[PDB]
Write a protein that binds this ligand. Structure first.
Ligand SMILES: [Mg+2]
Ligand SMILES: [Mg+2]
Ligand SMILES: [Mg+2]
Ligand SMILES: [Mg+2]
Ligand SMILES: [Mg+2]
Ligand SMILES: [Mg+2]
Ligand SMILES: [Mg+2]
Ligand SMILES: [Mg+2]
Ligand SMILES: [Mg+2]
Ligand SMILES: [Mg+2]
Ligand SMILES: [Mg+2]
Ligand SMILES: [Mg+2]
Ligand SMILES: [Mg+2]
Ligand SMILES: [Mg+2]
Ligand SMILES: [Mg+2]
Ligand SMILES: [Mg+2]
Ligand SMILES: [Mg+2]
Ligand SMILES: [Mg+2]
Ligand SMILES: [Mg+2]
Ligand SMILES: [Mg+2]
Ligand SMILES: [Mg+2]
Ligand SMILES: [Mg+2]
Ligand SMILES: [Mg+2]
Ligand SMILES: [Mg+2]
Ligand SMILES: [Mg+2]
Ligand SMILES: [Mg+2]
Ligand SMILES: [Mg+2]
Ligand SMILES: [Mg+2]
Ligand SMILES: [Mg+2]
Ligand SMILES: [Mg+2]
Ligand SMILES: [Mg+2]
Ligand SMILES: [Mg+2]
Lengths: 296, 169, 211, 159
RNA sequence: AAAUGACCUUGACCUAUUCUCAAACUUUAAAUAUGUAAGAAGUCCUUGUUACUUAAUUGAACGUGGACAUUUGAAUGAAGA
RNA sequence: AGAACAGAAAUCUCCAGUAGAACAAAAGGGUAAAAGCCCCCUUGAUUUUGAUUUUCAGUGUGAAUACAAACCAUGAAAGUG
RNA sequence: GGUUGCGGCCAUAUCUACCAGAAAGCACCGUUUCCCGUCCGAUCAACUGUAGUUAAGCUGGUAAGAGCCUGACCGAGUAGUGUAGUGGGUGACCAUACGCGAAACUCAGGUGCUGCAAUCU
């Protein structure tokens, strides 16, 4: 850095470091405190979070609860699972976000026992609804959306995950005003448009409009849609069939591994440098003051 | 080693400091509008001076930041006025550069006495790809030393393309 | 108009500095703490003699200045003004009050009367460095200064080298090999700790393990 | 005139622990309290709500209530020649589970074990605690260690 | 001739040093004092009650039934409490 | 450290920055994706009657804390008020 | 072992300068029809995962490095302090007896450990 900047030892000495996960720019604790903590008179009742994160085009849904030793995953679903259910493209998109949520919804809701009862909306006309408690039966499983550092904006796809997880039978308390199709100057939801996003309508129409306007770009991006021969119209039935596949068998097959833990460890340990002994460190000093010191 | 790191212009920011608010300022504003294609932004005075004749919060000036191909055009268009010769100053240690011109007519822009004549501060901030690390919300980082823009590097960049001169010392 | 110094001899009060809670206090009568040749190099003045207090008491700023003059005056006219380096080791930071005077003992909080240096037993008051050849001269300087002070103080010959913290042989060992480097009136020492880079920029005469 | 307000005199008491300022770590809220639990009271200056009065700083007591953000704590405070019962509403940031009974709980569970293991062999227990006893006799060897003889040392200076 | 000229000059600033200080300064931090605990109102197991609470006969509080006695859980004292 | 008029002080940019600022007011605590600064939506500065802490006689008054029963505000929400 | 998402303790994780990073992942990165936000699609929103890159982020290693953490009959049984005397001293103060006992200093050692889920030559 610059000379007149530097840092005093005095500066470094009194410096209080933030939490590691804040220094990493990952966890927002002000939100986390208020997400996690439980009514003290509910004792060991956990507070489950529906955690949604977007990598550069991969989607992550985990239902997570807290322990002072560390957090605990009840269940997890990623958008890269979607090829199993018949979605090979655009795994980062709104409709993909919906699907994954539904996947996460059915998956845990299954392994809790609430599989059969509480199926949520099977119709998906995109109406605004919460899964209601069943008269004389178990209350539904309750989960709170953890948006992380994502900005809340109306039409954001973090609320896509929310929609499918809600549509999947989970109880995720929410309002309608961040869903695509929310009107600014009147508080009203257009369900026609929200239904359109669930099925990828905004992507299909863009495919349409590039079909005849500019075919230079349509070839660049959407390239893969050509290779498998999928044009716009059929996209609604890709995601419709996806939903049914998910609801039929949510159960989460893992990858086949191939090269066990030991095996990956051996190969990776090659590329990790190792520290030295104080002996080695000392030997370098003495060597240095034989050379740099002793007049060449 | 230079794969990726290039010197893009991050943004160009035009600035006109008018000694007061009212008709003169909104005219300076109209200049930046039709010149930048964007609606400019105006700045209030931070405190009161009275030998400069200004009151705190008075809307003293207007400016605009332009990015993309647009910025290169206005850069070039002003560099022509400066006759493609800058000085060894104008170049910050952090790698940006700027100049200024009286009489905005020297770049395109016909006269129109209902408007009048204004000067401009031109200021160019250079950077490379991967600057997002500093500006993004999540995992906000700082760019590594070798990646950082330096004065030496930007003078060099400025000498090569535009084929202009640095002069001085 | 100064009260007789008998009045302030003992430390009866918690320290009362000049401060934002005080502010009105008068200037110290002793404003210079370094006399003689103060620019001089550590090597030039090996011998060090101290004026050392045997009491726990208070010394007025007036008496420090008075004694400063006394010692410095004697030393120069006898041994020369560049012969020695005199250092007053004690700074009068404690403010003495006074209640000056219809009204009685009512509301008796005093106003600043003057300054005093608080002083321990074994606590050093003056320090002087010279050539060994000058020892008698310096000692007579401190001995005369004594008459300007309340309470008992004694003069002690140091085991150290001038104003350093090292004893005479221990200093030589460090110097006569590599590790001592001049600074204006003082010396810097070579550390085994730290960057090997600029450790050898400074002290280049080391790392020969020789003279 | 004099000033006796609620937080008076509390300057360093409610101060924050050097290089410990800021948000309170999340484990403080993950802890769980039950009626009857024994807690220690220490105020957290960053949390202005639900704060103990300074008198109860460093004081230990028992939980008589559990509520949303807080726990009620009863404390015997002595005023006059007697103790009166005090009931404190405190937020969980100012309360900590006490280890004051830990050794006892440990010592009980260990005592049950030794007692069963004793009965199952036979008798011979001795499970009460005993004070430090004086040392037994011993034989110290001069081999390899012959007494070094020390004298007091003369007066010196080194100033 | 000027210089965003060079060179002396004194100020402030920066760097690494140096002498000395604090009731209303301080990283560190005593001694003396000070809170609680050292069991039968204790520990453990089995599984009832409810309008609280849980995704949930989940938990929370209060219970029924069962297991272990004076080394039953430090010291000293006790013209008793 | 850089930019016409522009100067010690106007407006523009980048870098450094543990808070060295700001939070009506005295001071002291406290606070950094806030408790500070800019914006959006608001009236919980509301309704009912008890318990509690400081001062204490364990009276009153002031101020405050944690719940219960309402009606509301805000936020995607947990929450918060 | 690596990596990611959510974490616990919150510098042995911070800071300054260099160098190295397989595979995967993260990343940077392309685009502006759509929801959405801007003086500026830079941030923010969406779309593609295609067109490109390990340069930066990120991970690790180096340094008689700064800071930080730990230890020691290092200093020091020192400073301070509870109890005692018809002890010393004009006094200021100071020794002694039965106890408790620091901080600085100095030297040595160290430079994140770890929970849940997923993935990877
Ligand atoms: Mg230093
Ligand atoms: Mg902080
Ligand atoms: Mg938030
Ligand atoms: Mg490259
Ligand atoms: Mg003007
Ligand atoms: Mg006294
Ligand atoms: Mg009088
Ligand atoms: Mg007065
Ligand atoms: Mg005398
Ligand atoms: Mg007072
Ligand atoms: Mg309040
Ligand atoms: Mg002192
Ligand atoms: Mg103090
Ligand atoms: Mg006691
Ligand atoms: Mg007993
Ligand atoms: Mg008895
Ligand atoms: Mg009896
Ligand atoms: Mg204040
Ligand atoms: Mg925050
Ligand atoms: Mg009111
Ligand atoms: Mg009173
Ligand atoms: Mg009464
Ligand atoms: Mg009052
Ligand atoms: Mg790769
Ligand atoms: Mg975005
Ligand atoms: Mg690299
Ligand atoms: Mg990263
Ligand atoms: Mg070091
Ligand atoms: Mg002593
Ligand atoms: Mg004592
Ligand atoms: Mg006596
Ligand atoms: Mg003593």
């Amino acid at each position: 850095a610059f000379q007149k900047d530097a840092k005093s030892s005095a500066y470094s000495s009194r410096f209080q470091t933030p939490f590691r996960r804040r220094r990493e720019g990952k966890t927002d604790y002000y939100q986390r405190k208020r997400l996690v903590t439980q009514h003290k008179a509910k004792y060991n009742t956990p507070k489950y979070r529906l955690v949604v994160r977007f990598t550069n085009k991969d989607i992550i849904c985990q239902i997570i609860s807290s322990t002072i030793t560390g957090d605990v995953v009840l269940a997890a679903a990623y958008s890269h699972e979607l090829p199993r259910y018949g979605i090979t493209h655009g795994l980062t998109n709104w409709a993909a976000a919906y699907a994954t949520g539904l996947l996460i919804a059915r998956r845990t809701l299954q392994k809790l026992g609430l599989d059969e009862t509480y199926k949520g909306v099977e119709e998906v006309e995109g109406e605004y609804e919460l899964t209601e408690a069943v008269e004389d039966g178990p209350r539904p499983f309750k989960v709170f959306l953890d948006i992380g550092l994502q900005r809340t904006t109306t039409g954001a796809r973090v609320f896509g995950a929310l929609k499918g997880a809600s549509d999947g039978g989970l109880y995720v308390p929410h309002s309608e005003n961040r869903f695509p199709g929310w009107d600014f100057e009147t508080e009203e939801i257009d369900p026609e448009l929200l239904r359109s996003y669930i099925f990828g309508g905004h992507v299909s129409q863009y495919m349409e409009e590039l079909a005849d306007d500019d075919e230079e770009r349509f070839s660049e991006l959407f390239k893969g849609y050509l290779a498998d021969d999928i044009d716009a119209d059929s996209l609604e039935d890709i995601y419709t069939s996806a939903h049914e596949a998910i609801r039929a068998d949510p159960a989460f097959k893992p990858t086949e591994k191939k090269f066990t833990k030991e095996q990956y460890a051996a190969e990776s340990k090659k590329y990790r440098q190792t520290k030295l002994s104080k002996e080695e460190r000392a030997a370098r000093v003495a060597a240095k003051i034989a050379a740099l010191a002793g007049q060449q | 080693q230079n794969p990726m790191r290039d010197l893009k212009i991050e943004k160009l920011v035009l600035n006109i400091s008018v000694g007061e608010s009212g008709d003169r300022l909104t005219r300076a504003s109209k200049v930046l509008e039709q010149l930048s294609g964007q609606t400019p932004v105006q700045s209030k005075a931070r405190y009161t001076v009275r030998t400069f004749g200004i009151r705190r919060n008075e809307k003293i000036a207007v400016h605009v930041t332009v990015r993309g191909p647009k910025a290169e055009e206005i850069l070039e268009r002003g560099l022509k006025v400066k006759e493609y010769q800058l000085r060894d100053r104008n170049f910050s240690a952090t790698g940006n550069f700027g100049f200024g011109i009286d009489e905005h007519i020297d770049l395109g822009i016909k006269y129109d006495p209902s408007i009048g004549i204004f000067g401009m501060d031109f200021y160019v901030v250079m950077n490379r790809p991967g600057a997002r690390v500093t500006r993004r919300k999540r995992c906000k980082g700082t760019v590594g030393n070798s990646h950082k823009t330096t004065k030496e590097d930007t003078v060099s960049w400025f000498k090569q393309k535009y084929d202009a001169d640095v002069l001085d010392k | 108009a100064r009260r007789p110094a008998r009045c302030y001899r003992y430390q009866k009060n918690k320290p009362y500095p000049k401060s934002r809670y005080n502010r009105a206090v008068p200037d110290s009568k002793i404003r210079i703490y370094d006399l003689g040749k103060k620019k001089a190099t550590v090597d030039e003045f090996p011998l060090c003699v101290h004026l050392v207090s045997n009491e726990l008491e208070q010394l007025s700023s007036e008496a420090l200045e008075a004694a400063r003059i006394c010692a410095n005056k004697y030393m120069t006219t006898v041994s020369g003004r560049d012969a020695f380096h005199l250092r007053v080791r004690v700074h009068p930071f404690h403010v003495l009050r006074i209640n000056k005077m219809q009204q009685g003992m009512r509301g008796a909080w005093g106003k600043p009367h003057g300054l005093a240096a608080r002083v321990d037993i074994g606590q050093i008051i003056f320090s002087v460095r010279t050539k060994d050849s000058n020892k008698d001269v310096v000692v007579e300087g401190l001995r005369r200064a004594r008459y300007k002070f309340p309470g008992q103080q004694k003069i002690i010959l140091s085991k150290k080298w001038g104003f350093t913290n090292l004893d005479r042989p221990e200093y030589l060992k460090k110097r006569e090999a590599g590790e001592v480097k001049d600074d204006g009136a003082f010396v810097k020492f070579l550390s085994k700790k730290g960057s090997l880079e600029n450790n050898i920029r400074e002290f280049p005469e080391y790392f020969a393990a020789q003279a | 005139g004099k000033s006796h307000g609620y937080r008076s005199r509390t300057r360093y008491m409610f101060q924050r622990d050097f290089r410990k300022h800021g948000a309170v770590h999340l484990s403080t809220y993950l802890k769980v309290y039950k009626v009857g639990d024994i807690v220690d009271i220490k105020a957290n200056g960053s949390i202005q709500k639900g704060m103990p009065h300074k008198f109860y700083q460093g004081k230990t007591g028992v939980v008589y209530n559990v509520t949303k953000s807080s726990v009620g704590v009863i404390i015997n405070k002595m005023v006059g020649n007697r103790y009166l019962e005090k009931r404190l509403n405190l937020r969980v940031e100012h309360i900590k589970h006490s280890k004051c009974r830990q050794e006892f709980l440990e010592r009980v569970k260990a005592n049950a074990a030794k007692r069963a293991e004793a009965k199952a062999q036979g008798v011979a227990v001795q499970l009460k605690r005993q004070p430090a006893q004086p040392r037994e006799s011993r034989i110290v060897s001069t081999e390899g260690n012959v007494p070094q003889t020390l004298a007091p040392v003369p007066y010196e200076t080194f100033i």
